Nucleic acid binder design. Structure first.
Ligand SMILES: N[C@@H](Cc1c[nH]c2ccccc12)C(=O)O
Ligand SMILES: [Mg+2]
Ligand SMILES: [Mg+2]
Ligand SMILES: [Mg+2]
Ligand SMILES: [Mg+2]
Ligand SMILES: [Mg+2]
Ligand SMILES: [Mg+2]
Ligand SMILES: [Mg+2]
Ligand SMILES: [Mg+2]
Ligand SMILES: [Mg+2]
Ligand SMILES: [Mg+2]
Ligand SMILES: [Mg+2]
Ligand SMILES: [Mg+2]
Ligand SMILES: [Mg+2]
Ligand SMILES: [Mg+2]
Ligand SMILES: [Mg+2]
Ligand SMILES: [Mg+2]
Ligand SMILES: [Mg+2]
Ligand SMILES: [Mg+2]
Ligand SMILES: [Mg+2]
Ligand SMILES: [Mg+2]
Ligand SMILES: [Mg+2]
Ligand SMILES: [Mg+2]
Ligand SMILES: [Mg+2]
Ligand SMILES: [Mg+2]
Ligand SMILES: [Mg+2]
Ligand SMILES: [Mg+2]
Ligand SMILES: [Mg+2]
Ligand SMILES: [Mg+2]
Ligand SMILES: [Mg+2]
Ligand SMILES: [Mg+2]
Ligand SMILES: [Mg+2]
Ligand SMILES: [Mg+2]
Lengths: 122, 16, 209, 114, 120, 56
RNA sequence: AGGACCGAACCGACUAAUGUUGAAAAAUUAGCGGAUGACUUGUGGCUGGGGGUGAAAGGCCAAUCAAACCGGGAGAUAGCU
RNA sequence: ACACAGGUGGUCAGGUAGAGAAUACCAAGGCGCUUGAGAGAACUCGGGUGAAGGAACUAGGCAAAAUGGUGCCGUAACUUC
RNA sequence: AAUUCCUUGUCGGGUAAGUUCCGACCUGCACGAAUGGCGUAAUGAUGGCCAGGCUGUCUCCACCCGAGACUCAGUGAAAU
RNA sequence: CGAUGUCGGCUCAUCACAUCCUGGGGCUGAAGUAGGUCCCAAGGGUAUGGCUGUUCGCCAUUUAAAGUGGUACGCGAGCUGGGUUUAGAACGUCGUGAGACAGUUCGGUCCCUAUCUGCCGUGGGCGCUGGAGAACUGAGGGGGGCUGCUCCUAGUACGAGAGGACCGGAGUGGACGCAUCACUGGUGUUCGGGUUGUCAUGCCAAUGGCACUGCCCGGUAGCUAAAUGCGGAAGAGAUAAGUGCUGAAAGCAUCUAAGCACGAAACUUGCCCCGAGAUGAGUUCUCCCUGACCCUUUAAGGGUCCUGAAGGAACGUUGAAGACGACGACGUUGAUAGGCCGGGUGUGUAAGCGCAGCGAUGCGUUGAGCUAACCGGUACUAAUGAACCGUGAGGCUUAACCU
């Protein structure tokens, strides 16, 4: 459950550190993004070197939500915090090159393969 | 005497 | 085709080999015994009339009893009609088991919704709630304007307003049939049907694809 | 719930060992990895438990690669397969939600050893 | 909205209620009859009859519990010595509610509640 | 919010079509003592269903 | 030492909700300011109506104020209703 | 104008904790406020808790929420020091 | 600008985006020196703007505890 | 003018169509993708933010789209009170001045218990022609009607390239809607525990009150959304613009004058719900009543004794039904509620006693003790024998059967 405003941590290099969701893309009036959805983003923190700089506007992939995820059977995965992987505005597709912290099976997408190939877990 | 709304200016003045 | 009358015992999962939780409402479906058949001759239409439960003798009235008398009695909870359509059934308490749905994939299901009794707007109609704050004077869950001005000079009919909510008919439709179990009188349909535990239910094969 | 119950216990696992909040269990869950149907191990602290027959679940807290992750297994689910206890926890407290506010060295729980 | 709820409110708060049915349990176990409004009477049962049951087994503990409720050593005493054994064999329903009806001052619907073997 | 016309004497009456009271009929007799009483209620004397409970 | 500081009594009246045929013709509740001073308070005194008093708002002078109240001229006058 | 949640100067002042005439629980003493009894709807008033989010509300963070003690360590621009 | 109509002037800053705000320019419709000019530490229930914390203010409302609202008994108003 | 409250927001709407999106078309300077324009179409859908009082507008970022209008520029006896607009104050400005400004600037109380109409709900009465219990028929009314993206068709048609389809499939979404608590969770002041201050139960030990439930950690049922099921359809009829077939008037041509075929989220249906006060009061099944007698102005006439049914209501215990009525379950030939038994769930190892320890405390007995609304059971208590209402064969006419 991510929604406009809401700070997210970032799970890649690129160098964002802290980032804010300025839109839940994908539908009129769409309230929440979560799981492995896409959101428009404005960088709030940014390391000094880094691909991205503060004030940039990009997209990103929700990779960990505290409300977590369910899928079949009835179980739950919850993560302590909210994190995402920055995507280039045109091509989706991570601008980063390393992923940090575990990611979930749901992300097993054509476009998000590069994330689960990286990333040390689930 | 008079009810408070009648005495009060904002409600009473209403259309100048 | 026709359908049957049951009783919501209700709601539990069943797990599958490849590890998936299927939430199911558990409908107990004791045999339905046709109390009457109806025909274009004895005017109107083609329908059957079943009963299903069991009732206290001292509770069954003379008339109700006399009606049960024609055909195999044992008075049940109540009566229900199903319209027919080129299927046929003779009245001698024909008795219809959950057998009926062995091959059915669909099923519609109709209960009597839990009784909310009031609600008013917000609950009843999902009306928005006025500023909780910011100066609002005694108008936090109220309905706000309910008309225009002189020119309609009235409130239109069917205006969404506070009042009775639930404890009414409502059916659900679609609903995959998960399991059929005769000599147990069970029927597991996938998930959630209207009305409370214990209440009466009518299930029919779904009218929609 | 008399006609239920029956439907339910005829699905319940019987091999499930006994654990207790605080224990450091490892749950080995099935996972269609991608092409392979393999086992995957989740090891962490039991922080809360169910106790509702067929619907029994429990929450295991892991602290992976920085910050925690919690998994609620429905205990009687096929996808679980194996579950062994691996360490005995001393807590006195049914739900260990307080651990969420701790971090590493501050979140260790004594052996129960009895 | 009350579906399947249990426990009357008697236009008090939890605190007031708790203390009142305490004073009343006493007043019943003591006098063995009291006059009270039918609602108040019916609820009294769910307080008293458990106590009597509890007393059917004498121990230090069971007394000390019967004292954390009621809080009057005279009544934890009358139970256990008298009412405990006096009903040691009775399934439940140690009381019965008899209705006289309609108090003068306020038209309140009224009733007697007695221990069932009062006899005396 | 206030009337614009005096409601009539007629209208008043109408509104009161339902305000009228019901008797009892369900008045019943004790099997031991004579005693009229409300059903399921103690009698004046303290009888109820033949038995004498309450001395008062 | 202090028109010094934090803060009850005491003196104030910045915000809000309630109340608006009130519990109350101006208050209640939660917060708020001052609190050894140009402070605050009991009793008693003096100032009178184009006059008083006013750290000044046309404020206050007995629930009355760009001229108090009571009686009088008096049945003012009213090309208006 | 009321058996009116208001106004009314002086005097006395116990225990436990506390800096305290704050505050909480008590003593001496004094009270339960002159309609009650049931119901456990909408709505209104006054409170409590809330998944994920955290000012996106709105004229405005209005209101709520938060801060809150004592000792020690430590504390920027600027400064009439 | 408590003064600027034209005006959301223009440039710089802050924001993903700023008719407000901070810094400037000077074209001051219509500042200006005790009906004082320009500054100013400290003070302010003073006006405007920003951020951290905080949260039912909001997304979007859920449940709960109390006082009314509802039912019975007694008393018994109001404006129009 | 003996008062017709006013910009903007909020809440709730409702119509029009000069249609923003979705649908169907003609023309195109229509290759394709995609546009333009006109025609038909009002079924549904039709953005969150920055700034400002704004509406608006600009900007950011979405979306299939972010439609134009009417409704006292809809909506203050629904809310707000930021703007204009009360008494205070200042700036610039005008004025000798009091003062003044569509100049600006900081600060200020929006009352009304709903009689009527209307509207959302819910009962009472009588009717419907003997009375009564059910189940129905369905005139009629309301509800619903949105849409993205990916994959296959197919890198095919088309195109020098770049690019890239119709038509037809398959999944999976957004917003919306109905239902439900199995899962995941919120609440859970009626369950358990921890803990501060203090008072009390004589004291130790153990407990209770008060402090917001004193503060707080968990949490049963119920109620619930963020939770999880389901829905919009397919089909059929008659059409809109439009396209046709055949075809004269008019030897030809022509969709039309006769005749025939296509044709859209609009229309009538299909789906869901209400529904015989449908006074045009309908249908079907079942149950109940088979006594005497008098008076007059002698007739759907009035009355007396007997009789009191089917059923209903009342009362009682009551419910996932409920404001009150209402609706459902049950009343001893009984599980209706409480209690009680067993279980579960929650909490998390009671008290007592022992051991260790100087003690705080730890351990053993002990996963103990306690445990609401849950589950399965159980007549211990309370649901009385009765009374009450309701009757005693049910109008005239004509027709058809039979006597
Ligand atoms: N108390 C009044 C205010 C008020 C009292 N007297 C007045 C005279 C005139 C105007 C207002 C008032 C209120 O409800 O706000
Ligand atoms: Mg007010
Ligand atoms: Mg309010
Ligand atoms: Mg009109
Ligand atoms: Mg029960
Ligand atoms: Mg308390
Ligand atoms: Mg001072
Ligand atoms: Mg001070
Ligand atoms: Mg005065
Ligand atoms: Mg005169
Ligand atoms: Mg004269
Ligand atoms: Mg008094
Ligand atoms: Mg007084
Ligand atoms: Mg005090
Ligand atoms: Mg009083
Ligand atoms: Mg009362
Ligand atoms: Mg929250
Ligand atoms: Mg801001
Ligand atoms: Mg807004
Ligand atoms: Mg804003
Ligand atoms: Mg504040
Ligand atoms: Mg607070
Ligand atoms: Mg300035
Ligand atoms: Mg001058
Ligand atoms: Mg000052
Ligand atoms: Mg009354
Ligand atoms: Mg008027
Ligand atoms: Mg048109
Ligand atoms: Mg208007
Ligand atoms: Mg203003
Ligand atoms: Mg190519
Ligand atoms: Mg080619
Ligand atoms: Mg002690």
């Amino acid at each position: 459950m991510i929604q406009e405003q809401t700070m997210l941590n970032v799970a890649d290099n690129s160098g964002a550190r802290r980032v804010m969701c300025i839109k839940v893309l994908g539908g009129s009036h769409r309230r929440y993004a979560g799981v492995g959805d896409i959101i428009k983003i404005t960088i709030k923190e940014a390391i000094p070197r880094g691909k991205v700089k503060k004030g940039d506007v990009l997209k990103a992939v929700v990779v960990r939500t505290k409300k977590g995820v369910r899928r079949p059977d009835g179980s739950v995965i919850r993560f302590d915090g909210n994190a995402c992987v920055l995507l280039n505005n045109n091509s989706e597709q991570p601008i980063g090159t390393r992923i940090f912290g575990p990611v979930t099976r749901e992300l097993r997408s054509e476009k998000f393969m590069k994330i689960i190939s990286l990333a040390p877990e689930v | 005497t008079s009810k408070w709304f009648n005495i009060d200016n904002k409600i009473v003045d209403h259309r100048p | 085709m026709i359908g049957l009358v049951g009783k919501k015992v209700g709601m539990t999962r069943i797990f599958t080999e490849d590890g998936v939780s299927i939430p199911v409402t558990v409908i107990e479906v004791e045999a339905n015994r046709v109390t009457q058949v109806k025909d274009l001759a004895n005017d109107g239409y083609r329908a059957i009339q079943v009963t299903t439960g069991a009732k206290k003798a001292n509770r069954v009235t003379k008339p109700e009893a006399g009606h049960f008398a024609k055909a195999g009695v044992e008075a049940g909870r109540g009566l229900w009609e199903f319209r027919l359509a080129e299927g046929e059934e003779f009245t001698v308490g024909q008795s219809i088991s959950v057998e009926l749905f062995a091959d059915v994939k669909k099923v519609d299901v109709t209960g009597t919704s839990k009784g909310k009794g009031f609600a008013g707007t917000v609950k009843r109609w999902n009306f928005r709630t006025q500023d909780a704050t910011h100066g609002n004077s005694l108008s936090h869950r109220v309905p706000g304007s309910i008309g225009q001005n002189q020119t309609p000079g009235k409130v239109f009919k069917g205006k969404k307003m506070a009042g009775q909510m639930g404890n009414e008919r409502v059916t659900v439709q679609s609903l995959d049939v998960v399991r059929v179990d005769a000599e147990r009188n069970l029927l597991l349909v996938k998930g959630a049907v209207p009305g409370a535990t214990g209440s009466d239910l009518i299930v029919k094969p779904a009218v929609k694809a | 719930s008399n006609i239920i119950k029956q439907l339910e216990q005829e699905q319940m696992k019987q091999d499930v060992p006994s654990f207790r909040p605080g224990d450091t269990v490892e749950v080995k869950v099935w996972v269609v990895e991608g092409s392979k149907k393999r086992l995957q191990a989740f090891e962490g602290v039991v922080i809360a438990i169910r106790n509702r027959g067929l619907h029994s679940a429990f929450t295991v807290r892991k602290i992976s690669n920085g910050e925690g992750v919690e998994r609620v297994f429905q205990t009687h689910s096929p996808v679980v397969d194996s579950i062994s206890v691996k360490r005995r926890g001393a807590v006195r407290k049914a739900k260990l939600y307080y651990l969420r506010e701790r971090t590493g060295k501050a979140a260790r729980i004594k052996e129960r050893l009895n | 909205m009350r579906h399947r709820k249990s426990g009357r409110q008697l236009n008090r708060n939890s605190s007031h209620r708790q203390a009142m049915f305490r004073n009343m349990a006493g007043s019943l176990v003591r006098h063995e009859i009291i006059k009270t409004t039918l609602p108040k009477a019916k609820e009294l049962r769910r307080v008293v009859e458990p106590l009597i049951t509890l007393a059917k087994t004498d121990s230090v503990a069971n007394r000390r519990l019967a004292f954390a409720r009621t809080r009057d050593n005279e009544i934890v005493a009358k139970l256990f010595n008298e009412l405990g054994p006096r009903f040691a064999s009775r399934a439940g329903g140690y009381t019965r509610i008899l209705k006289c009806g309609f108090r003068a001052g306020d038209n309140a619907p009224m009733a007697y509640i007695e221990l069932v073997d009062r006899s005396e | 919010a206030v009337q614009q016309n005096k409601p009539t004497r007629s209208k008043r009456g109408m509104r009161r079509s339902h305000d009228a009271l019901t008797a009892v009929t369900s008045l019943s007799v004790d099997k031991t003592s004579g005693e009229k009483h409300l059903r399921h209620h103690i009698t004046a004397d303290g009888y109820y269903r033949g038995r004498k409970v309450i001395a008062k």
